[PDB]
């Protein structure tokens, strides 16, 4: 009955495709065609953060929009002060192969992980003046590619073992496991309402998950290569993907299909990081061609370019008030742009 | 700047000094990426050279070495192989006694892996130290099992020397653009303690080339 089950799966896939095709009467291009586009984005390097002596692989802004944590492959986790450009903390890591870092919304913790398949939680605010690891979350059989704090006690991590997990930092055991991806999961994005998250994988598919129940809700398949970055629209009913075929795409949770494509002919390098402006008007993407691009989400125009990095732009984040954009890069430098 | 601001700046300066010291200390260490098949033999290489990835530390002639075993990463290597792009050398281990073994052929699988690693875009100029392990099993099996099982176009004497030379030549033939990177091939057995000196010599040559390029003179 294996052939019968495969035929049933194909029929269900075709049914889903035609059901989501029926509700695609218009396109995002036509609706936003008559609106005024972004004139010209021209940001400048307000600050340059120096002190990392290897490639930057991840950065995350703090909730206060002044502190930010940086992960670099020199084994250092640096918390910066983007205003005065001075280092608040410098955390040495047990394993220097770190691919992700996160900042707790409360600011009391940071997380990091990588080729060790472990998420480490560091207590920033102790009675002593040092930063110490509080718990190590083991249980992933592949490298950790992303991690995002739910609160002070819950964190969700993606891994290269085709699995996302939800952890309880109090006990150190993954309460929930989110299976279904056939490729390595590369990115995570928690919703503003925090009740669900999306995850892009190497199987060129993005999946929306329910944090409470622990099952996949929707699956989005429009890309041609591995999805490297995923980000949530500030509304919470959309998300953007950055893949290896030099194409960004926008998906709508309610419409359950791709909305609009962000690509150009002269860009043949994959996207390493994506992020959104505060209002969702500007989609910012870091690329392999040493510079970060600024796209207008509603019209898919290249509003601006954040050139200024001498190597691949690996990480990219916007503040919670939308005041600044920070870009890390493989040339070991972080840059704040306004 | 207030008093607290000045003290924060002073703390940041101390952090910067510590980071500079750490970077200076880390620049003095030689990093090696250990690759090869599971049964090719790397545990013996690791032993003779003394989940996640495994880091091995050893010192030889005032030179500090870091060896990274990535054989436990059961993921898609194209996503994390650039983490080792800046590396002194690659130690590739191949068991030349499994030419007649069946996992397709094990020797051909090792050849495919060597071809993929050598011609990777992240290791264009990274010298490869190739270890052909399990010498005496190969010698003992070359008398009965001929090399024709693995290579159908060998047409050579069924002796250890000719077969081993043919295998080494076939492996170094995969080195496309052999003008920037050099492959150091060594024949090692289980009971043979000379590989540390070979790795040190290859690393010293790589370091000479590296600081020749540093001096703007190459």
């Amino acid at each position: 009955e294996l052939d019968q089950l495969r035929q049933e799966a194909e029929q269900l896939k075709n049914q889903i495709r035609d059901a989501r095709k029926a509700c695609a009467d218009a396109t995002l291009s036509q609706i936003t065609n008559n609106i005024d586009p972004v004139g010209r984005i021209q940001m400048r390097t307000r600050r340059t953060l120096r002190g990392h002596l290897a490639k930057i692989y991840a950065m995350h802004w703090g909730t206060d929009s002044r502190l930010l944590v940086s992960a670099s492959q020199d084994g250092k986790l640096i918390i910066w002060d983007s205003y005065t450009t001075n280092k608040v903390h410098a955390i040495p890591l047990r394993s220097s192969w770190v691919m992700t870092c996160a900042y707790a919304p409360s600011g009391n913790y940071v997380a990091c992980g990588g080729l060790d398949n472990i998420c480490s939680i560091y207590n920033l605010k102790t009675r002593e003046g040092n930063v110490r690891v509080s718990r190590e979350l083991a249980g992933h059989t592949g490298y950790l590619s992303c991690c995002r704090f739910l609160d002070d006690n819950q964190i969700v991590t993606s891994s290269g073992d085709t699995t996302c997990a939800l952890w309880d930092i109090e006990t150190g055991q993954q309460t929930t496991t989110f299976t279904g991806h056939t490729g390595d999961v590369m990115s995570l994005s928690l919703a503003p309402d925090t009740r669900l998250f999306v995850s892009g994988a190497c199987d060129a598919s993005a999946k929306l998950w329910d944090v409470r129940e622990g099952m996949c809700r929707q699956t989005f398949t429009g890309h041609e290569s591995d999805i490297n970055a995923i980000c949530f629209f500030p509304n919470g009913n959309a998300f953007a993907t950055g893949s290896d075929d030099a194409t960004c795409r926008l998906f709508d949770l309610r419409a359950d299909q791709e909305l609009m494509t962000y690509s150009h002919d002269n860009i043949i390098c994959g996207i390493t990081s994506v992020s959104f402006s505060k209002s969702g008007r500007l989609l910012l993407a870091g690329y392999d061609d040493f510079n970060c691009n600024v796209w207008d989400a509603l019209k898919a125009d290249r509003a601006g370019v954040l050139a200024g990095h001498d190597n691949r732009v690996s990480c990219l984040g916007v503040t919670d008030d939308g005041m600044a954009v920070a870009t890390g890069s493989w040339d070991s430098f972080l840059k704040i742009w306004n | 700047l207030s008093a607290e601001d000045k003290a924060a700046v002073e703390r940041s300066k101390m952090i910067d000094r510590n980071l500079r010291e750490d970077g200076e200390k880390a620049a003095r260490e030689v990093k090696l990426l250990l690759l090869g098949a599971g049964e090719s033999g790397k545990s013996t290489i690791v032993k003779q050279m003394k989940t996640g990835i495994v880091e091995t530390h050893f010192t030889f002639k005032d030179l500090h070495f870091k060896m990274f075993d990535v054989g436990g990463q059961r993921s898609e290597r194209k996503k994390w192989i650039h983490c080792f792009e800046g590396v002194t050398a690659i130690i590739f281990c191949v068991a030349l006694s499994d030419y007649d073994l069946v996992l397709m052929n094990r020797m051909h699988e090792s050849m495919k892996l060597f071809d993929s690693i050598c011609n990777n875009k992240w290791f264009t100029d990274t010298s490869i130290i190739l270890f052909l392990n399990k010498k005496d099993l190969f010698e003992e099996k070359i008398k009965k099992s001929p090399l024709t099982i693995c290579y159908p176009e060998y047409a050579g004497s069924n002796t250890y020397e000719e077969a081993a030379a043919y295998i080494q030549c076939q492996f170094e033939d995969l080195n496309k653009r052999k003008d920037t990177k050099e492959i150091y091939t060594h024949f090692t057995c289980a009971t043979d303690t000379k590989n540390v000196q070979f790795v040190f010599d290859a690393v010293t040559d790589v370091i000479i080339k590296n600081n020749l390029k540093d001096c703007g003179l190459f």
């Epitope: 002044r66 502190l67 002060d81 005065t84 608040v88 903390h89 600011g107 009675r127 002593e128 003046g129 040092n130 | 207030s2 008093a3 607290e4 601001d5 000045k6 003290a7 924060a8 002073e10 703390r11 101390m14």
Partner: single-chain antibody, 232 residues
């Protein structure tokens, strides 16, 4: 976290003595440490400061050129060398740790305190109220004044509040006005603007009875304010 001070005792005038403080339970090397003295009947008074790494040292004008402060990070000890002691140098000396980064809380932990007795442009902080009679369970307010505006261009008002229970070392309540210190109940509140500041307690128990001090950290020599005693 504990700080224990050693030394003190009877000293003839014109003599010398060395004060030592032993630090345990925290990263002593990453903290800047202060010396603050309190006269037998008067309030607290700042003495000297040595930064992290000993790269910055400050002294009170009363002791400048006469006292010397040094630290031994591997030994986790803070030293105060004082020579030619005057009759006005008799006081109980406190050791205070204070770490400075963004969002930090300086002066958070104070030592037990050692006492020494000798036989026979600075910002001014004012606390007019004193010996306030207080009924438990009520709401009280303590006022403060400054000769200069403590509000810097950073937007930070460097006004610190401390509680000194009878027979106990002073403890931090609010570091930069309207910033409740860790381990302090939510009843205490800080408010103020410019040169006038207020400390408010919504409801109180017999625990928070004692002398309340106000300190400025805008510029050295880190002047204190006169005590505001609360009596049950």
């Amino acid at each position: 976290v504990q700080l224990v001070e050693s030394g003190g005792g009877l000293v003839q005038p014109g003599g010398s003595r060395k004060l030592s403080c032993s630090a345990s339970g925290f990263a002593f090397s990453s903290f800047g440490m202060h010396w603050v003295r309190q006269a037998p009947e008067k309030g607290l008074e700042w003495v000297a400061y040595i930064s992290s790494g000993s790269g910055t040292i400050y002294y009170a004008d009363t002791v400048k050129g006469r006292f010397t402060i040094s630290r031994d990070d591997p030994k986790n000890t803070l030293f105060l060398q004082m020579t030619s002691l005057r009759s006005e140098d008799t006081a109980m000396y406190y050791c205070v740790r204070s770490i400075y980064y963004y969002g930090s809380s300086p002066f958070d932990f104070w030592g037990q305190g050692t006492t020494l007795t000798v036989s026979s442009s600075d910002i001014v902080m004012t606390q007019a109220t004193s010996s306030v009679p207080v009924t438990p369970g009520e709401s009280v307010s303590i006022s403060c004044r400054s000769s200069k505006s403590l509000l810097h261009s950073n937007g930070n008002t460097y006004l610190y509040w401390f509680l000194q229970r009878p027979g106990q070392s002073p403890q931090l309540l609010i570091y930069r006005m309207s910033n409740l210190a860790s381990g302090v109940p939510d009843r205490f509140s800080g408010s103020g603007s410019g040169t006038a500041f207020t400390l408010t307690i919504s409801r109180l128990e017999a625990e928070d009875v004692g002398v309340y001090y106000c300190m400025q950290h805008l510029e050295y020599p880190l002047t204190f304010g006169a005590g505001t005693k609360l009596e049950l």
